[PDB]
Ligand binder design. Structure first.
Ligand SMILES: *[C@@H]1O[C@H](CO)[C@@H](O[C@@H]2O[C@H](CO)[C@@H](O)[C@H](O)[C@H]2NC(C)=O)[C@H](O)[C@H]1NC(C)=O
Ligand SMILES: *[C@@H]1O[C@H](CO)[C@@H](O[C@@H]2O[C@H](CO)[C@@H](O)[C@H](O)[C@H]2NC(C)=O)[C@H](O)[C@H]1NC(C)=O
Ligand SMILES: *[C@@H]1O[C@H](CO)[C@@H](O[C@@H]2O[C@H](CO)[C@@H](O)[C@H](O)[C@H]2NC(C)=O)[C@H](O)[C@H]1NC(C)=O
Ligand SMILES: *[C@@H]1O[C@H](CO)[C@@H](O[C@@H]2O[C@H](CO)[C@@H](O)[C@H](O)[C@H]2NC(C)=O)[C@H](O)[C@H]1NC(C)=O
Ligand SMILES: *[C@@H]1O[C@H](CO)[C@@H](O[C@@H]2O[C@H](CO)[C@@H](O)[C@H](O)[C@H]2NC(C)=O)[C@H](O)[C@H]1NC(C)=O
Ligand SMILES: *[C@@H]1O[C@H](CO)[C@@H](O[C@@H]2O[C@H](CO)[C@@H](O)[C@H](O)[C@H]2NC(C)=O)[C@H](O)[C@H]1NC(C)=O
Ligand SMILES: *[C@@H]1O[C@H](CO)[C@@H](O[C@@H]2O[C@H](CO)[C@@H](O)[C@H](O)[C@H]2NC(C)=O)[C@H](O)[C@H]1NC(C)=O
Ligand SMILES: *[C@@H]1O[C@H](CO)[C@@H](O)[C@H](O)[C@H]1NC(C)=O
Lengths: 50, 268, 197, 133, 35
């Protein structure tokens, strides 16, 4: 139910056994946990520029 | 909008607003580059100090560049550098990397050590350092006799003072209040601008996708408009604050350029 | 011959013209309403809805006007700063001779002349620049008869065989005399004193 | 590939010249084809310092240089109601209930115009009499 | 134009030329004393 675009990579953060995602600051999601495999994935915005 | 075609189409009928915002921000960036280049690039050639250093007993080792470190910075410059330490927003690098700034400072300092104030007017002319100090004493109403008869005492006093400066900078913190204040203000402005992206502004939610996947388009457009107006107003406020701050910084940079021209290339 | 020299005045003119151009161009936007012209909205609806449509136009145009005024205020402040600097330069470098280095010119300031320009001023600075240097050997004082002599103004030089005194900014040797030097102490505490007559 | 981004269509060399078209991170480009390089801050010299040697000029030159400064800009005024309504009584009546807005939007412009006149007068009018050659 | 006007400056450019001529004649003939 949490939607968004970006590129998904493998990360090494250590969630406590009850969080489902995380945000760094200014409330922007940075990591998620997949509901099936239960591993932490990291989100990076798709590249852009002038 | 952030990847929402309906939002873009609705925004189109607001005329040319954000073109002006981009114009203003680009002007700010160009002005920053001009400020730096105008303050520091005040020499035509890159002067170099001689290998053997006998400046009448004066000791400049703490300030001269250090070839050991790759940065080629000095002791005091290293102390200064160590002492102080997304949704469509980008940061562009400055044009002059700090190695070139260090090179400019080194050239200016070597020139003023070796050729007095002469290199500020035309070509640099060598002069032994004691004679330059005698000239400078004569410039404030004291005969050069006084300098020549008290050379060792003056050299010792200068060395002690320059040694004390380093301790004052190293031990006491919060000496670089102004630069830290500038950095903090800019960071806080960006933080609040990006924090504003989570406000309803009287709509039903704060996410475009949720509004789209819940309401009929003739009803969703109203909420989209309500979000658009608030976000646009926040952007306007941020740009105006940036303009004011840039004007203040430019005034300070002009003062710094005047000081560099008058108190380094001559005696005031 | 060369163009692109009066960049600043042209830039000011262009900025003002562009601001007016965008302000007048803003009058052709819906701002969320059904049309950008008042007459059609009046003639195609009833007052209870015509007023609703008109309100959006009103608020949009008001916002654009406010933005224009704020930009004008900022630019006027900057222009005032520049004008104050120009007045200071006119007062200090035209009606007198300035000693602060590099304030008006590149070299030793001699004089200046003003000229007018469509929205500004042009200063012609006349300065003095030395040239054609030459190496010399020097000394800080002269020991003679056990006394130390320093130059009243100028500097001791030698062409390898004899010593002279010169002014500091133009080579003009003269014979060392008891009239262009003064005495203080004996030749024992000065580092680099030389023997002469 | 550069610290400023990615650059296509130009050749990278190993020399260093003055900066023609600034690009960033200390590098810029020029035309010979288009080449990209690192800036050179200027010429290098080692001034001949010694503790008993000086240099003294023997001649001089006189130079004339120019400086350009802006002192004024055009004075403009705006009739708020004609711009925002343009001959519409209903629009005027609707605008009436937004309080005092138009007076503020005219005081600023009048101040700007007076300031322009003061700027010119302060810069130029500095002589009591009109001298003649 | 749709309600916007451009006002003329108070000093015409002939007067500005006259001021510059006066200043330059003064500096040529009397040094800095006239200041
Ligand atoms: C959801 O079901 C799948 C299908 O069984 C689970 O995936 C397997 O889980 C077992 C558990 O020991 C592993 O041995 C298999 O290797 C998994 N198969 C794979 C990864 O392809 C999955 O673990 C379940 N999710 C849970 C329990 O959270
Ligand atoms: C100039 O001052 C520096 C101190 O900053 C002197 O460097 C010291 O030299 C002594 C003797 O070689 C060493 O024992 C110290 O460790 C040095 N200090 C540092 C911080 O490196 C330097 O010698 C002085 N220059 C001259 C010509 O005497
Ligand atoms: C240094 O300058 C002195 C002063 O001019 C020179 O001495 C004179 O030299 C000329 C030509 O050589 C003679 O005609 C004079 O009789 C000399 N005057 C005296 C008092 O001896 C001297 O030759 C110069 N030396 C150098 C190396 O240039
Ligand atoms: C200027 O530098 C020179 C050269 O470094 C110094 O000359 C030295 O003087 C001492 C004492 O008279 C001698 O022991 C050395 O042999 C000299 N050097 C050479 C290379 O011969 C001179 O003392 C310095 N100071 C001046 C001239 O005031
Ligand atoms: C300048 O002249 C004085 C006196 O003519 C020199 O002093 C003599 O120095 C020598 C050796 O240093 C001694 O043997 C004499 O006794 C000194 N005489 C006197 C009267 O003090 C002095 O050395 C000369 N300066 C130079 C650089 O040679
Ligand atoms: C003055 O004396 C120096 C020393 O002999 C002359 O030579 C210059 O010396 C410096 C430092 O040693 C070098 O950087 C220059 O390249 C030398 N010049 C050459 C080799 O032509 C110098 O030419 C003399 N004249 C002047 C005007 O400086
Ligand atoms: C100082 O510089 C001036 C200008 O470079 C020299 O005047 C030149 O002299 C040569 C030879 O007499 C003439 O061919 C040129 O036409 C002169 N130039 C001008 C502009 O008149 C002057 O000779 C130099 N003075 C010294 C002492 O070298
Ligand atoms: C010259 O530049 C090339 C790439 O532009 C680089 O690979 C090389 O190391 C540089 N130096 C020499 C001596 O070729």
């Amino acid at each position: 139910g949490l939607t968004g675009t970006g590129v998904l990579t493998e990360s090494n953060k250590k969630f406590l056994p009850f969080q489902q995602f995380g945000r760094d600051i200014a409330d922007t999601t940075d990591a998620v946990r997949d509901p099936q495999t239960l591993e932490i994935l990291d989100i990076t915005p798709c590249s852009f520029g002038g | 909008c952030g990847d929402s075609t309906e939002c873009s189409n609705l925004l189109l009928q607001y005329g040319s607003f954000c073109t002006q915002l981009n114009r203003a921000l680009t002007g700010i960036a160009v002005e920053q580059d001009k400020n730096t280049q105008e303050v520091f690039a005040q020499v035509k050639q890159i002067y170099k100090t001689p290998p053997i250093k006998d400046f009448g007993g004066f000791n400049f080792s703490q300030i001269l560049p250090d070839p050991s470190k790759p940065s080629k910075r000095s002791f005091i410059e290293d102390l200064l550098f160590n002492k102080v330490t997304f949704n469509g927003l980008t940061v562009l690098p400055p044009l002059l990397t700090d190695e070139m700034i260090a090179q400019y400072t080194s050239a200016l300092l070597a020139g003023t050590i070796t050729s007095g104030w002469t290199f500020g007017a035309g070509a640099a002319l060598q002069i032994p350092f004691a004679m330059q100090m005698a000239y400078r004493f004569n410039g404030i109403g004291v005969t050069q006799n006084v300098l020549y008869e008290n050379q060792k005492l003056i050299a010792n006093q200068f060395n002690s003072a320059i040694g004390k400066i380093q301790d004052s900078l190293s031990s006491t913190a919060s000496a670089l209040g102004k630069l830290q204040n500038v950095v903090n203000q800019n960071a806080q402005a960006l933080n609040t601008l990006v924090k504003q992206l989570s406000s309803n502004f009287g709509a039903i939610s704060s996410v475009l996708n949720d509004i789209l996947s819940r309401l009929d388009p003739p009803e969703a457009e109203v909420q989209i408009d309500r979000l658009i107006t608030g976000r646009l107003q926040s952007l306007q406020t941020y740009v105006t604050q940036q303009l004011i701050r840039a004007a203040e910084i430019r005034a300070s940079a002009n003062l710094a350029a005047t000081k560099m021209s008058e108190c380094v290339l001559g005696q005031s | 011959s060369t163009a692109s020299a009066l960049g600043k005045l042209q830039n000011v003119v262009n900025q003002n013209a562009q601001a007016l151009n965008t302000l007048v161009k803003q009058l052709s936007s819906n701002f969320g309403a059904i049309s950008s012209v008042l007459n059609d909205i009046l003639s195609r609806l009833d007052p209870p809805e015509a007023e609703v449509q008109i309100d959006r136009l009103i608020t949009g145009r008001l916002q654009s006007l406010q933005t224009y005024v704020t930009q004008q205020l900022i630019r006027a402040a900057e222009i005032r700063a520049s004008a104050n600097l120009a007045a200071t330069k006119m007062s200090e470098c035209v009606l007198g001779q300035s000693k602060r280095v590099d304030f008006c010119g590149k070299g030793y300031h001699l004089m200046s002349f003003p000229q007018s320009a469509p929205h500004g001023v042009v200063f012609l600075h006349v300065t003095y620049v030395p040239a054609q240097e030459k190496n010399f050997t020097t000394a800080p004082a002269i020991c003679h008869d056990g006394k130390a002599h320093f130059p009243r103004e100028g500097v001791f030089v030698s062409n390898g065989t004899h010593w002279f005194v010169t002014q500091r900014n133009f080579y003009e040797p003269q014979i060392i005399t008891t009239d262009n030097t003064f005495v203080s102490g004996n030749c024992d505490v000065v580092i680099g004193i030389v023997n002469n007559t | 590939q550069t610290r400023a981004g990615c650059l296509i269509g130009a050749e990278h060399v190993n020399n260093s010249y003055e900066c023609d078209i600034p690009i960033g991170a200390g590098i810029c480009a020029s035309y010979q084809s288009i080449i990209a390089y690192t800036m050179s801050l200027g010429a290098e010299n080692s001034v001949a310092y010694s503790n008993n040697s000086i240099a003294i000029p023997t001649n001089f030159t006189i130079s004339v240089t120019t400086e350009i400064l802006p002192v004024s800009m055009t004075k403009t005024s705006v009739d708020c109601t004609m711009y925002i309504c343009g001959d519409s009584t209903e629009c005027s009546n609707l605008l009436l209930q937004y309080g005092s807005f138009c007076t503020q939007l005219n005081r600023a412009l009048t101040g700007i115009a007076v300031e322009q006149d003061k700027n010119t007068q302060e810069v130029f009018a500095q002589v009591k009499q009109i001298y003649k050659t």
